[PDB]
Amino acid sequence: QCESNPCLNGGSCKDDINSYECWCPFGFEGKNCEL
Amino acid sequence: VVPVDYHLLMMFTKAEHNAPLQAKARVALSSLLRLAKFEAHEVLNLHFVSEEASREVAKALLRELLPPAAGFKCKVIFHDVAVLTDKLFPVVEAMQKYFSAGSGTYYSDSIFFLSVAMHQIMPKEIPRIIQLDLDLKYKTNIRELFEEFDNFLPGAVIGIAREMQPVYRHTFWQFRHENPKTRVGDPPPEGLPGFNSGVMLLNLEAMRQSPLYSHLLEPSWVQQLADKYHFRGHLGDQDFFTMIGMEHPELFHVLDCTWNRQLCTWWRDHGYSDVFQAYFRCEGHVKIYHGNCNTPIPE
Ligand SMILES: *[C@@H]1O[C@H](CO)[C@@H](O)[C@H](O[C@H]2OC[C@@H](O)[C@H](O[C@H]3OC[C@@H](O)[C@H](O)[C@H]3O)[C@H]2O)[C@H]1O
Ligand SMILES: O=c1ccn([C@@H]2O[C@H](COP(=O)(O)OP(=O)(O)O)[C@@H](O)[C@H]2O)c(=O)[nH]1
Ligand SMILES: [Mn+2]
């Protein structure tokens, strides 16, 4: 399987090769919406 | 006496040297068997989808659990994952790019769509089958689940419980953005939060006999809806049914949450603290716990 993409855009899997930006659900920040 | 068969199907693959999976399987199958009761002429058929090493593992587990306490007739059947994968592929290929991790279309993902084409895979002598995850714990007689087939309204082909996390609220983000007033991805009792595939009542006859259901399996329908919903997933059958459930909720008899009480809270801690509770609430007497995302089941 793959880990869900925490970003709102791009593919279903985190670190989607064709995704450049990461829009995080409200209240989270980072390249993986960590903080 | 006119023998009456009941059919369950479980995926059980890559189980050699997977002790966590074997222990889950052990909890599921012992609870199932300890609590099951069937009349004398009835037989419970346990179908397992497995490659050859996992077939051997399952046989070792099963011999320890059979015959069941309750002394009813039980038959075990194995289906080769490789054979099923090749039968599924023509039907299922076009959906894979939308619902598999991540892209594009790999044989290894085809088996995760088994339920969507189960009516083309199982012989015609099987009219109905219940597909179940192995990370379940049964708190009642599985025979009772079969009466839910009786509650299918005309046109319904599948019985399935709602997804109890906001994963589809997240997945449908763009569609929700473009359609502020949508119920798509909202929590119950009035939202459409999508489906969980851990427990599914596949009415094979009704699936075979539905013009609507057959059409939705067509490559161009799959593509039109995935475009309309801007939908991308990696959860396979669960994603496809969720999607077509947005367009055609008539197809699905929604099971009560107590028939698939999901324990996973991964999404709570990934951006959905506020709303999480509204998705996750389930009350009533629990019939099946589902320890999804490797969540310990309580006792
Ligand atoms: C996002 O990625 C995380 C980390 O890998 C997963 O834990 C999430 O999946 C969990 O939350 C959503 C549930 O729908 C999912 O459970 C389903 O798994 C697919 C089906 O095969 C299964 O029966 C169903 O329970 C759960 O694992 C993921 O969204
Ligand atoms: O390596 C695997 C992974 C999954 N499964 C089957 O498919 C389900 C999918 O994942 P699981 O239930 O372990 O986690 P969930 O998907 O419910 O989070 C399991 O219950 C098993 O029946 C399997 O047979 N082998
Ligand atoms: Mn599960």
> Is it true that the peptide bond before B102 is cis, omega within 30 degrees of 0?
yes
B106–A contact, CB cutoff 8 A: no
Cα-to-centroid distance, B133 and ligand 2 (Å): 6
Structure tokens at B62: 């099963």
Taking alpha carbons only, the member of B150, B132, B136, B246 closest to residue B203 is B150
Write down the experimental method used for this entry.
Answer: X-ray
Instruction: Check if B222 has its Cβ closer than 6 Å to any atom of ligand 2.
Output: no
The ligand 1 atom nearest the CA atom of B262: 25
Structure tokens at B248: 């055609």
The strands making up B42-50's β-sheet, listed across from edge to edge, are B73-80, B42-50, B4-11, B128-132, B195-203, B158-162, B252-255
Q: How many residues does chain B have?
A: 299
Known binder of ligand: residue A7? no
Q: Look up residue B164 and give its amino acid.
A: M
Inter-chain CB pairs, A–B, below 8 Å: 45
Select the residue of A1, A6, A17 nearest B234 (Cβ to Cβ): A1
Do B144 and B137 contact (CB within 8 A), yes or no?
Answer: no
Do A25 and A33 contact (CB within 8 A), yes or no?
Answer: yes
B234–A contact, CB cutoff 8 A: yes
Q: Count CA atoms closer than 13 A to B268's CA, side-chain side.
A: 12
Residues of A in contact with B234 (CB under 8 A): 1-2, 4, 12-13
CA distances from B225 to B21, B27, B229, B245 (A): 35, 38, 6, 11
Beta-bridge partner residues of B161 = B196, B255
Residues of B in contact with A7 (CB under 8 A): none
The strands making up B261-262's β-sheet, listed across from edge to edge, are B136-138, B288-290, B261-262
Whether A11 sits inside 8 A of B273 (CB atoms) is no
DSSP result, chain B: ---EEEEEEEE--S-TT-HHHHHHHHHHHHHHHHH----TTEEEEEEEEE-HHHHHHHHHHHHHH-S-TT--EEEEEEEEHHHHHHHHHHHHHHHHHHHSSSSS--HHHHGGGGGGGHHHHS-TT--EEEEE-SSEEE-S-GGGGGGGGGGPPTT--EEEEEPSSTHHHHHTHHHHHH-TT--BTPPTTTSB--EEEEEEEEEHHHHHH-HHHHHHTSHHHHHHHHHHHT---SSTHHHHHHHHHHH-GGGEEEEPGGGSEE---GGGGGT-HHHHHHHH---S--SEEE-TTTPPP--
Do B193 and B121 contact (CB within 8 A), yes or no?
Answer: no
CA distances from B181 to B16, B115, B186, B227 (A): 48, 32, 10, 19
Instruction: Check if B136 has its Cβ closer than 6 Å to any atom of ligand 2.
Output: no
Structure tokens at B261: 């009480």
CA distances from B16 to B61, B197, B210 (A): 12, 24, 39
B194–A contact, CB cutoff 8 A: no
CA B62/CA A2 separation, integer angstroms: 31
The secondary element (H helix, E strand) that includes residue B212 is helix B211-216
Q: What residue numbers bound the domain in which A14 lies?
A: 1-35
- What is the dihedral angle through the alpha carbons of B122, B126, B129, B135, rounded to the nearest 10 degrees? -60
Contacts of B195 (CB under 8 A, 6+ apart): B160, B161, B162, B163, B238, B241, B242, B245, B252
CA B231/CA B172 separation, integer angstroms: 7
Experimental structure resolution, Å: 2.0
CA B234/CA A12 separation, integer angstroms: 6
CA B247/CA B236 separation, integer angstroms: 18
Q: Count CA atoms closer than 13 A to A34's CA, side-chain side.
A: 3
Closest-CA residue, ligand 1 atom 9, reads B293
Instruction: Check if B23 has its Cβ closer than 6 Å to any atom of ligand 2.
Output: no
For B86, counting Cβ atoms within 10 Å of its Cβ (0-12 exposed, 13-18 middle, 19+ buried), the class is exposed
Residues of A in contact with B170 (CB under 8 A): 4, 8, 25
Nearest residue in chain B measured CA to CA from A10: B232
Please state the domain count of chain A. 1
Structure tokens at B32: 């199932």
Give the N- to C-terminal CA distance of chain A in Å, as an integer.
25
Name the DSSP letter for residue B218: S
Q: Which ligand is closest to the CA of B267, given by its number? A: 1
Do B293 and B196 contact (CB within 8 A), yes or no?
Answer: no
Taking alpha carbons only, the member of B177, B161, B197, B169 closest to residue B268 is B169
CATH number of the domain where residue A26 is located = 2.10.25.10
